[PDB]
Write a protein that binds this ligand. Structure first.
Ligand SMILES: CCCCCCCCOCCOCCOCCOCCO
Ligand SMILES: CCCCCCCCOCCOCCOCCOCCO
Ligand SMILES: CCCCCCCCOCCOCCOCCOCCO
Ligand SMILES: CCCCCCCCOCCOCCOCCOCCO
Ligand SMILES: CCCCCCCCOCCOCCOCCOCCO
Ligand SMILES: CCCCCCCCOCCOCCOCCOCCO
Ligand SMILES: [Ca+2]
Ligand SMILES: [Ca+2]
Ligand SMILES: [Ca+2]
Ligand SMILES: [Ca+2]
Length: 402
């Protein structure tokens, strides 16, 4: 007990991606949902080997009634083959764990957080996987980790299904599934920088390596230089169920932080015969994580700029603004090759705004609210995955810690 941990989160999420050109038959992807999530992580039994258990429990509700059925699926709620939402969905993940010195083994339901396998947090509930995770912290400053998983339960699903890939913008021959995925590597923490390397195989689909670093380095007493750089290398393997895969992808975001301001510039580029592959049900793993597209197409070059302010030291009269944060960012992607268009190339851009407030003290401490807006355009054909849209996400969350 004594080192157990538990939290209960209540979430209200409205999602509206309002398509500019109403690609028949939908005017928007939209849903309004509420969710409860319980996350419990026990400590370990005493013994040379210690044992414990972790649990994740999720209950979600539709707040739009049958009205929801006239819109394209958001991902907040399960949607049936006639487009009707399920009005309620519930699901439980359990994990058994064992520890020997600073080595831990986890078997069951998992929420991976690696560049080769990163559970999507971007809808109501987390994506989860079923398998085995091993983590060693025996080496100071280095965390070694691996996953072997064979099923995935998507954020908007109550069922485990086979691991695999989605087909974004017809990037590959098809979306495919398979029976296993494994990844292993490590993360090394320096004073001001973290360095990471991982290898992954999605059986008969692709192999992928990652190298990356991120840091926050003081240039003097008041100015910090922030960096996050990610490199992927991907190739097809085995029976090559999605066909050729041939990609290198580099992305970086570089920022200056001064007196609670941050200004950053971002760059991405894809190289190779294809775009970037990654697991189904989740966002691209590259540095720029925008609302309305993955920005990860074959040959796409991406330029971005970002501004943020943390209002920790700001006030409006007697009202402290601590717990307010503002961000805005713009990205443009060009030289997009959709493969089936000869020498034609495509382009896309996004202007986003993000305002979040978390109550810092008092009775309502822990209550958070966020509003995000994206104006997204592209000149891509109508059979592609992402369409010009004005996208709004509104969140109100409250977490109780036990
Ligand atoms: C390899 C697959 O093994 C894990 C299957 O897990 C099911 C949930 O298990 C909870 C175990 O306590
Ligand atoms: C209720 C206010 C919501 C405001 C949202 C828009 C914010 C645009 O924000 C940037 C705000 O920061 C301006 C303050 O300038 C201070 C000067 O430099 C040092 C301050 O730490
Ligand atoms: C090496 O990756 C960066 C450069 O790739 C150039 C395009 O190569 C095409 C063959 O995959
Ligand atoms: C000369 C730079 C002009 C560009 C203006 C953009 C400003 C967006 O950042 C707002 C920062 O408020 C800063 C407080 O000092
Ligand atoms: C839409 C334009 C891009 C963002 C520009 C922001 C430029 C500065 O705007 C400041 C607006 O005010 C925010 C409210 O600030 C309250 C207190 O800040 C106190 C700083 O000590
Ligand atoms: C939509 C993205 C908007 C990008 C903002 C450009 C920021 C230019 O910043 C210069 C000043 O920044 C504040 C420095 O604090 C003093
Ligand atoms: Ca519309
Ligand atoms: Ca159903
Ligand atoms: Ca319904
Ligand atoms: Ca090849």
């Amino acid at each position: 007990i004594a080192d157990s941990k538990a939290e209960l989160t209540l979430r209200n999420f409205y999602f509206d991606r309002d398509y500019k050109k109403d690609p028949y038959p939908y005017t928007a992807a939209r849903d309004w949902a509420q969710g409860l999530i319980f996350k419990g992580q026990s400590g370990y039994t005493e013994g040379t080997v210690g044992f414990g258990v972790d649990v994740l429990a999720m209950a979600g509700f539709n707040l739009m009634g049958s009205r929801a059925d006239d819109y394209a699926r958001s991902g907040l709620l399960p949607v049936n083959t006639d487009n009707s939402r399920d009005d309620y969905y519930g699901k439980i993940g359990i994990t058994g764990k064992a520890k020997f010195r600073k080595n831990e083994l986890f078997v069951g339901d998992l929420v991976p957080q690696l560049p080769t396998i990163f559970s999507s947090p971007a809808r109501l509930f987390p994506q989860t996987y079923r398998g085995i995770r091993f983590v060693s912290n025996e080496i100071p400053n280095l965390q070694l980790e691996g996953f072997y998983v064979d099923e995935v339960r998507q954020r908007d699903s109550i069922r485990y299904t086979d691991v695999g890939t989605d087909n974004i913008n017809h990037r590959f021959n098809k979306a495919a599934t398979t029976d296993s995925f494994y990844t292993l590597g490590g993360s090394y923490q320096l004073k001001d920088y973290r360095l990471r390397a991982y290898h992954a195989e999605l059986k008969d689909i692709y192999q992928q390596q990652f190298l990356g670093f991120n840091g926050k380095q003081p240039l003097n007493d008041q100015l910090n230089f922030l960096s996050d750089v990610r490199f992927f290398n991907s190739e097809e393997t085995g029976s090559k169920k999605i066909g050729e895969v041939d990609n290198r992808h580099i992305s970086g975001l570089f920022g200056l932080n001064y007196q609670n301001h941050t200004v950053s510039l971002g760059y991405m580029q894809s190289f190779g015969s294809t775009g970037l592959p990654f697991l189904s049900g989740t966002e691209s793993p590259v540095v720029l994580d925008f609302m309305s597209s993955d920005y990860s197409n074959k040959d796409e070059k991406v330029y971005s700029i970002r501004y943020e302010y943390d209002f920790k030291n700001a006030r409006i009269g007697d009202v402290s603004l601590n717990g307010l944060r503002f961000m805005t960012r713009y990205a443009k992607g060009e030289d997009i090759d959709l493969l089936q268009y000869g020498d034609q190339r495509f382009k896309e851009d996004s202007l986003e705004f993000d305002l979040g407030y978390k109550i810092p003290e008092g009775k309502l401490k822990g209550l958070g609210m966020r509003a995000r807006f994206s104006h997204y355009r592209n000149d891509m054909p109508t059979n592609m995955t992402f369409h010009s849209a004005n996208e709004t996400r509104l969140n109100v969350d409250y977490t109780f810690k036990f």
